[PDB]
Symmetry: C5
């Protein structure tokens, strides 16, 4: 694809917006606040391996990637034309919303005074993971796991075995180029398995950060004044193949810890995207 | 006043206004008495905890809320509007946290010695300047939390219905405007990134229980409020809206580790200029 | 005095002045005797704690206060004024905190072994350069604190009335000027962002009890003092005011965890030029 | 090609090459079997400790080593050489550390509950791109350490003599080249700043035992490899050398707190251009 | 030559010189024997503590001291002087801190298991490049500290009198020059910001007892030594002075938590140019 001039004229630039809700483990339904809906925005209680050779995490304890495909206005009446137009993502304003809610320390989490069961309800703390991507095709994924012996469910999550039709190999604990996928479904690809593939993603920009630990304070900034530029070193943004725009993210804030067996629940927050796009002549 | 034209020139075409917004941590400014509750002003009252997984009823005076003020600008009226160009803002009083001589939980609890533990823990700093109220998006830890119906504005105040599970993530139904001081809890109401076209807001959060508080202050830092097109917030009906919350953490008492939120006041000095509009 | 014109050129139109300000942590410079109290110079005396929720009376020698100096500039005299253009400032002596061979509370309390615990905890660094005293805004942790009525300047010194609940937030009545060294407690008096038009100040605070102290120092960093219009502080009556406080944390003794504040001295090298004024 | 001339223009004058380097934490890639040792690939084997002050004999499979690869470039031959201009490099797989559901030491050891403690502690990230092997300088914690003679390249491998006390500081005798993958221990061999004229390296270290691991990753960051004269690494005999190590910390087992190092793979995409040389 | 003129052009008008300065943590380079004390080279000997508030006598070999070297430049002599333009500097060997397989205090003290605790705690990194010795200002934790009279240069060495209480803050009488390697304790002697007109120095301090050490290293970073007028240090008598200290923290033994300071060597590569002076 040869990238030519910017298209000018009426409606040559557009802005589109979307929010992607977190996918921490509990699905959006049931909505009932007694039947499981109370866990929406969180994982269910993390379940642990029972031995070095018996690690079977439940699907609803595994945070997964959020994604959305946005369909842009059709540009080309005839794809056989020598010169065509594509939507180009120029920039994005993105924000993780709701960090203020972590200031709720009046609930029933493990308390800070364990002698008297007093103090405050311990706020969300621990490992944090924030990634977002904007591209003109699905985010390319590279698999890499802690333990190739982990017995992921065969139904309900897309894992390395889903792709290869074979059990994971020891190479999957490092970089195994066979273990690749595309982020083509929301709430299905676990973030402890699937990472942005630096060997592909030519038509996507992604930005990630990880902070580990168990009691690490969560940190977040938010403003409506920060623009993320999506143009590459040549001044070209992601080009939307068949007018499809792909948004991908995960925003883990840490865990809350309950008063029962120190059970941990992952917490995630929703992410806003406002993408500025322009029409680009291509051949 | 939709089409933004040239800057207005001449006498009184630029103005500076200043204000301080005091924190709204839970204890109201009155009663002033230092024995009848006034001693908690600048702080929350002691945080009260849920009694079960289904019984979380926080008292209003334990919930920090947004501070806000609407300032009236000089009368103006191709019309003219006041345009907010920049702001110098500062959180005042961090030095007061150096008081470690009080009666808080001491650092040596065995012998009741050491120092009075200073304010520590979760911190939250947001400010906004706009030409209309800050647009708010609701999102809570727990849609089952039983907020009081009177004395605070919560999601149910707006919807007239109980919160739903979607309120623990992003539910576009749960929106409000920051139109009252000391009423909108910060654990519920967040700046809405899908609106606020005419407001600039800047926020940061640092969590934890014993995290050291950190603050910088200088009179030399200017925050520019102009957008990508060089246009600042435009003050509808000559009203300028200031919004903030500045939580430094908690102090902890010697009685069952009772926590009190600590907030500090924020200064604003806004430069505004008249703008031609059509 | 008010209208700022061109820079003055010619012989001696620019000058550099330097000063060091020693910390004022609570123990005065005298007695010099290393047995009669002088051993605490550079530090506070042992921090004394409240005996109840209503009885908090800190001793003056436990309260760090602002350091300040007024320097006299060469006589001058459309008139001329000295204008402060820039400053190189440095906090000196952080290397001294590497002394872990003393008699502080040891790191192994089981065997009374390990190292002498180094200075740690809450840190506070502010400096200012101006053409008149630093304007101060009072704000306290506790309006009930019984500060001494002798040997220190507090809110009550200024107002002639006891503190009120508003003094725990921003009370605009509670203002002062930094006009004396070692007299204004830093837990009471903060730079006033509503004034200080003719001063530049820069501050930071890091809290906690065991927080590692952090400091950088170099002779290669210049702080510009010119405002947005290219004008530095103008020295009224040829007086230049320097203000600072540099708290590094506390050391802790082996006797009931008694804490002593540690401060360090700050160097200033100010570059000034003559400015025509009308 | 000592003298560097103009850039070569025309067809095929610029190229991009990519590679990934897997970590070398101690367990080799084979056996592949997940019961026969393959389950430790990407990790070290359990770190074994000294039995006395004079008996420190670490096993080879407990010692992380440098990763390296030599890539062959298109044949070229006033002569031409490949010049590395820039690199995009990324450490892949930090999300895998979010697995806290395994059988590591649990966060609640009193009841054996909570979560599986994630990887924490000392972290070390270095990468280099050059036109010849990375030059290494030896420096160790303890010159008395009894490294194996076979299976690792250590100081004694090079000198044919035991380590001396100078090897605990900078001993210029103790030098080597990174010419083999998975053989040079990172606790011994460091980039040599006195050499490496034709390589660029970038490193950082963060220590401690329970330190939270931190990592950023993006496909939008380019590292320029040009020196102060605008010249990148020149590839001798069309060979491009990539070198790295990326230690994230340790996992800790439920059996006597045995630690295993964790490494992650590093991606490189290098842009090269032809350069005229004389 | 006080007046600085044009740069000198022509053959050999620019030169580049390199050196490494080994750390001076307390144990001298000799004896070399790894049983007779050489095993501590690169480290201090075990830190010895005060026995009372009035009895603090640290041994010389427990006190880290400044490293320094004077390098002789090519002979030169309107005269010419060598001017230091820039320096590439690097602290080498942080990877050696990844040795957690030795006999230090273990991470699991209950069972004496886990890993050998890595170096942690207070860190101090300073370097300087100048045309004369680094100017030093004395400042101590405790003016009562009984430093040895022989084998170290301390305040009393210079003044011929015991330290005074002012030595715990800034006492202008307590000054020296860094004219000897491994002799000036870093807990006493600091770069003097009131002098050093012909030297650039850059320092940082991070305190605490278990703080994770942090270090970055690269061969791509240049430190410019030119002042605000574009003039670098001028080498008096063709002598170039390099000064540094690089403390990474302590290791802790299994015997009564004895601490040993760890230091690392520093590389310098200085670019110099001939300058016309009069
Ligand atoms: C309860 C249990 O042992 N669950 C266990 C499961 O055991 C199977 C059988 O349980 C059920 C069930 O989930 O209730 C019976 C159902 O009929 C069946 N549903 C259907 C549609 O067929 C399901 C279903 O088979 C399965 O869940 C699908 O995976 O199973 C049990 O009766 C029988 O003895 O054994 C059965 C098979 O072993 O088996 C699972 C493995 O297949 C799991 O082992 C499961 O344990 C749960 O695992 C999740 C992670 O997957 C998690 O760790 C969970 O721990 C939490 C949690 O839900 O996240 C941690 C929370 O902190 C904790 N909350 C509080 C406040 O303490 C929460 C509660 O303990 C739950 C446990 O379900 O109790 C409540 C609750 O949420 O508070 C109690 C409420 O009164 C109740 N509401 C009502 C209206 O009754 C809710 C409600 O049922 C659920 O929220 C709906 O999902 O549950 O545990 C860990 O328990
Ligand atoms: C005391 C109590 O049980 N409060 C409790 C409340 O109980 C109701 C009745 O108490 C009162 C009351 O607040 O005193 C009686 C009043 O007549 C009534 N007023 C009116 C106009 O009708 C109020 C009012 O109805 C209610 O507050 C409004 O909701 O109620 C009590 O007599 C009866 O037995 O039960 C009644 C309800 O059934 O009910 C509330 C819920 O409705 C709360 O449960 C409330 O508990 C307080 O809750 C807040 C959070 O909202 C907070 O956790 C508070 O804990 C603190 C605090 O005040 O923040 C934590 C502080 O750290 C702690 N300070 C110290 C130094 O220890 C502080 C003290 O323990 C308070 C307790 O009130 O004692 C002092 C004080 O501030 O130090 C003691 C002083 O001597 C006293 N001053 C004087 C001059 O006497 C002050 C002063 O009363 C108050 O500050 C004024 O507000 O109180 O507690 C937690 O107690
Ligand atoms: C000693 C005492 O009780 N002082 C308190 C004072 O008591 C009054 C009077 O002095 C008593 O004789 C009488 O019984 O009671 C009256 C009451 O009116 O009352 C004051 C209020 O007016 C205070 O309560 C005062 O207590 C002191 O308060 C300060 C804060 O204001 C400190 O908290 C102080 O504690 C320290 C300190 O000096 O900072 C903490 C420090 O860590 C301690 N140092 C050591 C090594 O342990 C010292 C130490 O305990 C002092 C107490 O004064 O003893 C020495 C010293 O080491 O400094 C012992 C020396 O032998 C002595 N020097 C000589 C030559 O004799 C030296 C010297 O007197 C003083 O330093 C000079 O100021 O004191 O305490 C807290 O005690
Ligand atoms: C087993 C043993 O003692 N090994 C040590 C070795 O002993 C020699 C010989 O093997 C013995 O039978 C005999 O008695 O003694 C001779 C020598 O005299 O000698 C070596 C020195 O030459 C070492 O001392 C060695 O000890 C091992 O040293 C390495 C470092 O080099 C590690 O510290 C290792 O500890 C681990 C490890 O493997 O990394 C720590 C780890 O966390 C442990 N894992 C778990 C789940 O607990 C393992 C574990 O204890 C190993 C011990 O080898 O057991 C398994 C395993 O889980 O990995 C058990 C499996 O069932 C087995 N698989 C099969 C199919 O049988 C598996 C497999 O043998 C190995 O992984 C292949 O390498 O081992 O220990 C430390 O033990
Ligand atoms: C041993 C002793 O008591 N030394 C103190 C010295 O005593 C003098 C004399 O040596 C004694 O025989 C006699 O009884 O008393 C006189 C003086 O009255 O006096 C000094 C003051 O003048 C000191 O008090 C000195 O104590 C030593 O002080 C230094 C600081 O100056 C250190 O704190 C030192 O502690 C360490 C150290 O050396 O740094 C801490 C370290 O962690 C320890 N290492 C280990 C592995 O445990 C060592 C260790 O205990 C030393 C003590 O010297 O023993 C060895 C060693 O391991 O280094 C044992 C070796 O076998 C030996 N080698 C040989 C071939 O014999 C080796 C060697 O002598 C020394 O390294 C040479 O310097 O010493 O202690 C603290 O002990």
């Amino acid at each position: 694809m040869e990238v030519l001039d910017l298209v000018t004229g009426p409606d040559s630039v557009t802005e589109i917006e979307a929010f992607l809700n977190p996918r921490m483990g509990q699905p959006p339904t049931p909505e009932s606040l007694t039947e499981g809906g109370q866990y929406y925005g969180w994982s269910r209680g993390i379940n642990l391996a029972t031995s070095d050779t018996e690690d079977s995490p439940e699907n609803n304890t595994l945070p997964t990637w959020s994604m959305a495909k946005l369909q842009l206005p059709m540009l080309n009446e005839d794809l056989t034309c020598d010169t065509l137009q594509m939507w180009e993502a120029v920039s994005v304003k993105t924000e993780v919303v709701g960090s203020g809610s972590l200031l709720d320390v009046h609930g029933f989490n493990k308390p800070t005074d364990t002698v008297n069961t007093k103090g405050i309800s311990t706020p969300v703390e621990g490992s944090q993971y924030h990634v977002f991507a904007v591209g003109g095709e699905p985010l390319d994924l590279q698999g890499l796991v802690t333990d190739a012996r982990t017995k992921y469910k065969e139904e309900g999550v897309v894992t390395i075995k889903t792709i290869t039709k074979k059990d994971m190999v020891n190479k999957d604990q490092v970089l195994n180029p066979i273990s690749k996928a595309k982020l083509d479904k929301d709430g299905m690809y676990p973030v402890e398995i699937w990472h942005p593939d630096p060997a592909k993603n030519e038509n996507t920009r992604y930005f990630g950060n990880y902070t580990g630990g168990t009691t690490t304070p969560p940190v977040l900034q938010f403003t409506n004044t920060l623009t993320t530029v999506l143009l590459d070193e040549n001044g070209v943004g992601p080009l939307c193949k068949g007018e499809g725009l792909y948004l991908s993210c995960v925003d883990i804030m840490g865990w809350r810890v309950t008063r029962n067996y120190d059970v941990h629940h992952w917490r995630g927050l929703p992410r806003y995207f406002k993408i500025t796009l322009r029409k680009r002549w291509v051949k």
